[PDB]
DNA sequence: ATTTTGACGCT
DNA sequence: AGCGTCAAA
């Protein structure tokens, strides 16, 4: 009880982009703003595979991963924006750009973790704390958190859904105690202030939308921003967290989605986050370890301890590119070829990094997959970087993967491979 | 024949 | 160091 730690010690917020890709061809071409579109890589086979899908054209069924010749047989009238190609492969530089805009304002509020091209997760209980101080323990105004939700509200003794979100923020409102600067969910409520603000900077000044969850962890914001998508908001506090895991299936929490949540599953006989409140820690850490035990243990009460990490650059720098079916590549000049169209975008990339970032990658990684092997990987080898050179590091490449050809013969490569990726990685200042 | 990414844990 | 897992668009 009195000793008991409930994990409401920070406030932390996810913000994710929707649909990010989209946006930003949106952004780029009028025409396709407001209408079902897509964004595509490459057009030959089946019309192309689909990676980000408009809020529109998810209404019709497109989902990413499909084909773009069947999602037009789901929305014939699909608008489709192609990634740019380079050196013969799709090249993600325009997304990469439009992160870093994203990524630059969202750090003027706080110190932010890059997680991926389009999220980050924020640490905001300093700011906070600052604003609480200069709020005079002034009650906080529905108005100022005009796109939040308070997850688990309204509840108890309207139709539309702004006027349950309204009745839901208003029940919260009202219960909140303005006057303790320390209660967790008045920071949490002052944090989802901050995060309209930042939300609203972002589409200000890029044009963006995107939605953000505010909780006291990552793992509870991660979840909750995904409550409410698109253009808006959710507030998941820790006193919401018993009645949001008793259905919420095991698998919809972040790093609970593989093998590791399936295991859990079979193993305990169970289905929901909450269920496994009635296990012991050392049930746990017998079943999935030590670690895993007592992240579980403590994640299904609400609790996870895991910082946001400053860090707004990525730490690898990498290309890759697929020969699928029969275009594997066979000839010992079609592996060079490609190990240099690969390590000729990397340089690029390279030079514009140490440019902007005054660091150099230290380390180069070749990774390649072997025509009928069950991973994604088949073999990885590193050697050093010293130059940032095309020609050298496209050698340097194959000579560290040459050993893998088992032919006899000169020319051929054998088994043909499925897979190049080139990676730098080992950052120093500089 | 989703492809092209990125972070982190285990041994 | 090399492999495997989990996740993004
Ligand atoms: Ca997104
Ligand atoms: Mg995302
Ligand atoms: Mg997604």
């Not at 061809?25 to 595979?49: D, I, M, T």
């Not at 005009?146 to 688990?152: F, K, L, M, R």
Request: aromatic share 6%; charged share 25%; glycine share 6%.
């Amino acid at each position: 009880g009195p000793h008991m730690a409930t994990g409401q010690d920070r406030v932390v917020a996810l913000v994710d982009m929707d649909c990010f890709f989209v946006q930003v061809e949106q952004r780029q071409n009028p025409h396709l703003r407001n209408k079902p579109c897509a964004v595509v890589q490459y057009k030959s086979w089946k019309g192309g595979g689909i990676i980000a899908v408009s809020y529109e054209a998810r209404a019709f069924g497109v989902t990413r991963s499909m084909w773009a010749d069947d999602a037009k047989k789901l929305c014939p009238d699909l608008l489709l924006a192609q990634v740019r190609e380079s050196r013969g492969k799709a090249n993600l530089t325009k997304y990469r750009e439009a992160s870093v805009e994203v990524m630059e304002i969202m750090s003027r509020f706080a110190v932010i973790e890059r997680a991926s091209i389009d999220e980050a997760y924020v640490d905001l209980t300093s700011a906070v704390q600052e604003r609480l101080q200069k709020l005079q323990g002034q009650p906080i105004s529905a108005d100022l958190l005009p796109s939040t939700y308070i997850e688990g509200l309204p509840q108890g003794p309207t139709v539309q859904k702004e006027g349950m979100r309204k009745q839901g923020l208003f029940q919260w409102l009202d219960s909140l105690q303005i006057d303790n600067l320390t209660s967790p969910d008045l920071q949490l409520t002052v944090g989802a202030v901050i995060v309209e603000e930042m939300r609203a900077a972002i589409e200000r000044e890029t044009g963006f939308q995107c939605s953000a969850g505010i909780s006291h962890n990552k793992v509870l914001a991660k979840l909750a921003c995904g409550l409410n998508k698109p253009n808006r908001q959710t507030l998941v506090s820790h006193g919401s967290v018993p009645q949001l895991f008793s259905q919420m299936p095991i698998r919809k929490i972040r790093s609970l989605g593989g093998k590791l949540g399936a295991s859990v599953i079979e193993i305990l006989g169970i289905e929901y986050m909450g269920e496994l409140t009635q296990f012991t820690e050392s049930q746990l850490q017998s079943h999935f370890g030590e670690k895993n035990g007592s992240w579980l243990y403590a994640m299904c009460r609400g609790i996870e301890h895991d910082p946001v990490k400053p860090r707004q650059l990525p730490k690898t720098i990498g290309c890759s590119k697929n020969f699928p079916g029969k275009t594997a590549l066979a000839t010992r000049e079609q592996v060079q070829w490609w190990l240099l169209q690969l390590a000729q975008e990397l340089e690029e990339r390279l030079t514009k990094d140490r440019n902007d970032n005054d660091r150099v990658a230290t380390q180069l990684v070749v990774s390649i997959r072997v025509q009928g092997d069950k991973r994604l990987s088949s073999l990885r080898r590193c050697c050093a970087l010293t130059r940032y050179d095309a020609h050298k590091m496209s050698h340097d490449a194959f000579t560290v993967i040459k050993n893998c050809n088992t032919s006899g013969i000169q020319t051929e490569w054998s088994p043909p491979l499925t897979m190049l990726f080139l990676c730098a990685t080992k950052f120093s200042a500089s």
